Amino acid sequence: NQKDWTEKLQAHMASLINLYDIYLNDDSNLVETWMKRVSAAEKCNVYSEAILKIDPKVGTPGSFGRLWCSYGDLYWRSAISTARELWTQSLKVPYPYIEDLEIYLNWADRELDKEGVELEDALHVPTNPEILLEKYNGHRKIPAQTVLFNSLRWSKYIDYLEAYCPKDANKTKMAYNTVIDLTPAMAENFALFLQNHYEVMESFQVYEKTIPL
Amino acid sequence: PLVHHDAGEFKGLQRHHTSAEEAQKLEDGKINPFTGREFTPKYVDILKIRRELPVHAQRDEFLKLYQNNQIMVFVGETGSGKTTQIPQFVLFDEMPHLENTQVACTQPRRVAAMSVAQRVAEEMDVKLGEEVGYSNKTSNKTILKYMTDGMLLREAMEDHDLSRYSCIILDEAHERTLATDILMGLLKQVVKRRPDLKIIIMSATLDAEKFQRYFNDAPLLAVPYPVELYYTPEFQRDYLDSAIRTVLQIHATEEAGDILLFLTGEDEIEDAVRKISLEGDQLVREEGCGPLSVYPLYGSLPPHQQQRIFEPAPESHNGRPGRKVVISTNIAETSLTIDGIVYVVDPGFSKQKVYNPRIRVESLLVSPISKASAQQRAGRAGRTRPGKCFRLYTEEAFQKELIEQSYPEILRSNLSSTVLELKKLGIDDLVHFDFMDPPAPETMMRALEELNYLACLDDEGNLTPLGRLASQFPLDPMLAVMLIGSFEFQCSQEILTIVAMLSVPNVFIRPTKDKKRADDAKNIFAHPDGDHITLLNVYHAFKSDEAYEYGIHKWCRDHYLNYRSLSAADNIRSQLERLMNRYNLELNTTDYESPKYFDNIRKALASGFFMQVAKKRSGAKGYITVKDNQDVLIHPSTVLGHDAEWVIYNEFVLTSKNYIRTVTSVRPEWLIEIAPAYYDLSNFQKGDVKLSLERIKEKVDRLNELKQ
RNA sequence: UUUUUUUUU
């Protein structure tokens, strides 16, 4: 047991050899998987965070631990689905916080961390905007996504614009033309908008502007 | 003693001379011939229904054979009313209540016996568990007794001549199960001792020649929609792609009706399911094909998920024929009627058991099916409506390439148990013993060797108290010996639980698309150095008050666990506990606070599974088995994340590689202590990786003894 | 990365 303790202290001083020492010693096992934690990977950090969330009476402790886990896993991320799940989960923590009445401000903070992250991130902005509109402040969030796209005033950001202009409709005309400065389906769609508003002749003009291209 | 009606309306006939007319005259009566009850309208309707069954039209003839022959064979179409009507015919000819005897009908399944007991109980207008019953609902008034072959085998083990029965019926003898064959072999001698016994052999399909020739030229009674057969002109290079493409083809072109596809394993089946689902959806979307519903079907599924195949075909909004595709193993190959199935797709492959006498081990291998099996698979259709069967092989292959009829299980399976049971029957010279089909002497000798090391058979060849005790249990001899020796390590309850958990299919649920959360949920119950210990934790958590306060089934559906497997395990554990209490085995356990807890459990495990031990290659990759010296690896579903160089395993499985399933770390010292007979250095081959450090452990032991 | 079958209210 003492030599195993030396194997443990050596593990603290530290790969698999410590685990072999653990087998030589063979709650300590869960402690050992925890040691593996002490050493897709970030996704595993998320899945374990999910099972821990299932295990979450100090749920707040497991959640804050998930936050510090975000602080550690962020180093591993040097991003899309990692950052995306990271945002969806953080906002989910502020969502369970919202259920706890514990949340939108901290959600704005984690979303600010998403701003600190460095198109899936645009999905994150789309998410903060999504709950933000689900929150009962529709225009206020649109002003923010607009703050981002205006911040882009690049070409890659335009796919996010199609991600944004698609719901920015619910005036929008110039917002749409900004795309023309920088996709036929998009064109026919927009002309269909004006047709729905029955601008008619203006709509025909759009087809003039498409075909010159 | 059996309670019965004294009768009197039965008198007027010489024994064994009952005609059909008299029986029918008793049937149409307002009063029951065997009980004092009056007949219900339900009985009238059911009688009207069953009187039109094909087996009834031959009743007279059946009687005329059964009266003049001691042993007879019976073959009829599927669902003609064999299992239900034949024993009643027997009841009408015999005098079971007058001569104070029972009549036994044997089913190879529990559910079979139970269900048919229900149906027949409703047919004879008796309450289930009274005069007609299954075993157990059998009381002292029970005349018609449905039972598994194992139960009849037990009653045969307690009473050699089976004096309680005057007529014994074995249905579905085409499966040739262990208990069935043993029972036939016994009955062949019982008929020599007592001529008052009659034996009936029933099956829907059979190679009746073997049965007739075995029972000394026994008589055979054979009682009488088109299914079209399609063969491929050429050979199909990849049977899987051929299967998928052909199923999609039947979906796109052929007439209305459901499709039944046979495949190999659950992995292959899942792959085929998701592929056929995807391309099927694409077919509906782009080529305007009808809606398609694919359902998987294999043994490891819960009974509900198995029942899911009988769901109606998908509704159609577009007008295109919506249909259902049932992807199954050979579980639906024999005796099963699905209403919607019209088409049957057969690649001609299955997974069968292969045994190597040199290694003395059994594994599973993909093999070509048999002619009989093909006729069965093709016979699944053409019941509700005319069927069409697409076989993915040439007719020339059917005539030549395909085996005549599936090799018997006894000639394949490890006996290791068969020998023990034969010895319990009282057979001394098994080599000289009269089988219908004698097994391989190599396998026999190795089995006797295993039982010799397990101390079930002494050096002389007779049964030890350990063998005589372990024979009564429904377990594999190793599991048995382990369970018996358990209470000496003061942990018999835990070992009992572990055995029960090993006797049930895989508990853990692992979704294809959600592996992480399932693996975490398993890691919660996971225990270092032991899969068995982990299983014990799982059952101990399932039987916990907390899990009952949550929602048990909900709790199982929250921790990624199979409720069916867990409840089945609880049941098995109850049975084994009852048996332990019957043969007087102490239920003993130790505190978790005691550090010798896990060690006791491990030791008790080694007591029965010392022959199945693996050692990791010193300074290399992979493991190697002590027995027969085979290179092996640890199964991916094993908890042990660290390299324990000495392990005890439960299952040997062949798939992508030679894998070892369900393990637990052990000390070689314990192994030497428990089974010195098998672990003497003299037994094993020259200097190999195992022996080299085993001898080091020996040097260690001898130094320990030297210092004292 | 790979559970064919079965194992008494």
PDB file of N, CA, C and O (backbone and C1' of nucleotides) in Angstrom, chain B residues 136 299 351 474 503 636 655-657, chain C:
ATOM      1  N   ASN B 136     -45.004 -23.165 -11.765  1.00  0.00           N
ATOM      2  CA  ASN B 136     -45.852 -24.260 -12.220  1.00  0.00           C
ATOM      3  C   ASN B 136     -47.296 -24.068 -11.758  1.00  0.00           C
ATOM      4  O   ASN B 136     -47.552 -23.688 -10.617  1.00  0.00           O
ATOM      5  N   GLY B 299     -32.569 -12.121 -31.225  1.00  0.00           N
ATOM      6  CA  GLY B 299     -32.795 -12.649 -29.891  1.00  0.00           C
ATOM      7  C   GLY B 299     -32.481 -11.736 -28.720  1.00  0.00           C
ATOM      8  O   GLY B 299     -33.102 -11.846 -27.664  1.00  0.00           O
ATOM      9  N   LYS B 351     -25.501 -17.930 -38.951  1.00  0.00           N
ATOM     10  CA  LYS B 351     -24.375 -18.092 -38.040  1.00  0.00           C
ATOM     11  C   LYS B 351     -24.530 -19.387 -37.252  1.00  0.00           C
ATOM     12  O   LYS B 351     -25.500 -19.561 -36.515  1.00  0.00           O
ATOM     13  N   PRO B 474     -29.567 -25.875 -13.162  1.00  0.00           N
ATOM     14  CA  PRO B 474     -29.722 -25.586 -14.591  1.00  0.00           C
ATOM     15  C   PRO B 474     -28.601 -24.704 -15.129  1.00  0.00           C
ATOM     16  O   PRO B 474     -28.852 -23.827 -15.955  1.00  0.00           O
ATOM     17  N   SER B 503     -26.222 -15.675 -16.465  1.00  0.00           N
ATOM     18  CA  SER B 503     -27.177 -16.563 -17.120  1.00  0.00           C
ATOM     19  C   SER B 503     -28.175 -15.802 -17.993  1.00  0.00           C
ATOM     20  O   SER B 503     -29.027 -16.404 -18.643  1.00  0.00           O
ATOM     21  N   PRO B 636     -13.934  -5.243 -26.105  1.00  0.00           N
ATOM     22  CA  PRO B 636     -14.079  -3.789 -25.941  1.00  0.00           C
ATOM     23  C   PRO B 636     -15.098  -3.359 -24.882  1.00  0.00           C
ATOM     24  O   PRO B 636     -15.054  -2.215 -24.436  1.00  0.00           O
ATOM     25  N   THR B 655     -15.171 -13.080 -33.677  1.00  0.00           N
ATOM     26  CA  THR B 655     -15.801 -12.153 -34.609  1.00  0.00           C
ATOM     27  C   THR B 655     -14.750 -11.541 -35.536  1.00  0.00           C
ATOM     28  O   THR B 655     -14.191 -12.234 -36.387  1.00  0.00           O
ATOM     29  N   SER B 656     -14.482 -10.249 -35.371  1.00  0.00           N
ATOM     30  CA  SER B 656     -13.416  -9.590 -36.118  1.00  0.00           C
ATOM     31  C   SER B 656     -12.075 -10.213 -35.749  1.00  0.00           C
ATOM     32  O   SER B 656     -11.228 -10.455 -36.610  1.00  0.00           O
ATOM     33  N   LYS B 657     -11.894 -10.471 -34.459  1.00  0.00           N
ATOM     34  CA  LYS B 657     -10.707 -11.146 -33.950  1.00  0.00           C
ATOM     35  C   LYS B 657     -11.114 -12.151 -32.875  1.00  0.00           C
ATOM     36  O   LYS B 657     -12.291 -12.259 -32.535  1.00  0.00           O
TER      37      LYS B 657
ATOM     38  O5'   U C   1     -14.337  -1.352 -29.579  1.00  0.00           O
ATOM     39  C5'   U C   1     -15.313  -0.595 -30.282  1.00  0.00           C
ATOM     40  C4'   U C   1     -15.229  -0.830 -31.771  1.00  0.00           C
ATOM     41  C3'   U C   1     -15.427  -2.266 -32.239  1.00  0.00           C
ATOM     42  O3'   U C   1     -16.795  -2.633 -32.328  1.00  0.00           O
ATOM     43  C1'   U C   1     -13.546  -1.315 -33.329  1.00  0.00           C
ATOM     44  P     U C   2     -17.524  -3.380 -31.103  1.00  0.00           P
ATOM     45  O5'   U C   2     -17.834  -4.839 -31.660  1.00  0.00           O
ATOM     46  C5'   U C   2     -19.105  -5.158 -32.223  1.00  0.00           C
ATOM     47  C4'   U C   2     -19.095  -6.511 -32.892  1.00  0.00           C
ATOM     48  C3'   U C   2     -18.887  -7.706 -31.962  1.00  0.00           C
ATOM     49  O3'   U C   2     -19.608  -8.830 -32.475  1.00  0.00           O
ATOM     50  C1'   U C   2     -17.129  -7.621 -33.539  1.00  0.00           C
ATOM     51  P     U C   3     -19.597 -10.218 -31.679  1.00  0.00           P
ATOM     52  O5'   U C   3     -21.139 -10.463 -31.363  1.00  0.00           O
ATOM     53  C5'   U C   3     -21.641 -10.369 -30.016  1.00  0.00           C
ATOM     54  C4'   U C   3     -22.972 -11.073 -29.906  1.00  0.00           C
ATOM     55  C3'   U C   3     -24.195 -10.165 -29.891  1.00  0.00           C
ATOM     56  O3'   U C   3     -25.309 -10.814 -30.494  1.00  0.00           O
ATOM     57  C1'   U C   3     -24.049 -11.313 -27.834  1.00  0.00           C
ATOM     58  P     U C   4     -25.111 -11.663 -31.835  1.00  0.00           P
ATOM     59  O5'   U C   4     -24.570 -13.061 -31.298  1.00  0.00           O
ATOM     60  C5'   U C   4     -25.468 -14.030 -30.722  1.00  0.00           C
ATOM     61  C4'   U C   4     -26.189 -14.785 -31.812  1.00  0.00           C
ATOM     62  C3'   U C   4     -27.247 -15.773 -31.335  1.00  0.00           C
ATOM     63  O3'   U C   4     -28.529 -15.154 -31.297  1.00  0.00           O
ATOM     64  C1'   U C   4     -25.704 -16.892 -32.728  1.00  0.00           C
ATOM     65  P     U C   5     -29.437 -15.275 -29.986  1.00  0.00           P
ATOM     66  O5'   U C   5     -29.532 -16.850 -29.758  1.00  0.00           O
ATOM     67  C5'   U C   5     -30.445 -17.654 -30.528  1.00  0.00           C
ATOM     68  C4'   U C   5     -30.839 -18.886 -29.749  1.00  0.00           C
ATOM     69  C3'   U C   5     -31.167 -18.654 -28.279  1.00  0.00           C
ATOM     70  O3'   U C   5     -32.561 -18.428 -28.107  1.00  0.00           O
ATOM     71  C1'   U C   5     -29.507 -20.324 -28.457  1.00  0.00           C
ATOM     72  P     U C   6     -33.091 -17.641 -26.819  1.00  0.00           P
ATOM     73  O5'   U C   6     -33.147 -18.773 -25.702  1.00  0.00           O
ATOM     74  C5'   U C   6     -33.789 -20.036 -25.959  1.00  0.00           C
ATOM     75  C4'   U C   6     -33.463 -21.020 -24.862  1.00  0.00           C
ATOM     76  C3'   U C   6     -33.493 -20.458 -23.446  1.00  0.00           C
ATOM     77  O3'   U C   6     -34.777 -20.644 -22.860  1.00  0.00           O
ATOM     78  C1'   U C   6     -31.402 -21.482 -23.837  1.00  0.00           C
ATOM     79  P     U C   7     -35.231 -19.738 -21.622  1.00  0.00           P
ATOM     80  O5'   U C   7     -34.333 -20.281 -20.423  1.00  0.00           O
ATOM     81  C5'   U C   7     -34.647 -21.503 -19.770  1.00  0.00           C
ATOM     82  C4'   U C   7     -33.507 -21.989 -18.912  1.00  0.00           C
ATOM     83  C3'   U C   7     -33.162 -21.142 -17.695  1.00  0.00           C
ATOM     84  O3'   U C   7     -34.021 -21.388 -16.589  1.00  0.00           O
ATOM     85  C1'   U C   7     -31.178 -21.717 -18.856  1.00  0.00           C
ATOM     86  P     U C   8     -34.997 -20.236 -16.062  1.00  0.00           P
ATOM     87  O5'   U C   8     -35.872 -20.983 -14.960  1.00  0.00           O
ATOM     88  C5'   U C   8     -36.757 -22.059 -15.323  1.00  0.00           C
ATOM     89  C4'   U C   8     -38.148 -21.790 -14.798  1.00  0.00           C
ATOM     90  C3'   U C   8     -38.217 -21.218 -13.387  1.00  0.00           C
ATOM     91  O3'   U C   8     -39.345 -20.362 -13.248  1.00  0.00           O
ATOM     92  C1'   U C   8     -39.248 -23.341 -13.422  1.00  0.00           C
ATOM     93  P     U C   9     -39.410 -19.313 -12.042  1.00  0.00           P
ATOM     94  O5'   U C   9     -40.932 -18.845 -12.054  1.00  0.00           O
ATOM     95  C5'   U C   9     -41.904 -19.468 -11.193  1.00  0.00           C
ATOM     96  C4'   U C   9     -43.299 -19.203 -11.703  1.00  0.00           C
ATOM     97  C3'   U C   9     -43.819 -17.786 -11.489  1.00  0.00           C
ATOM     98  O3'   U C   9     -43.542 -16.975 -12.626  1.00  0.00           O
ATOM     99  C1'   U C   9     -45.349 -19.327 -10.565  1.00  0.00           C
TER     100        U C   9
END
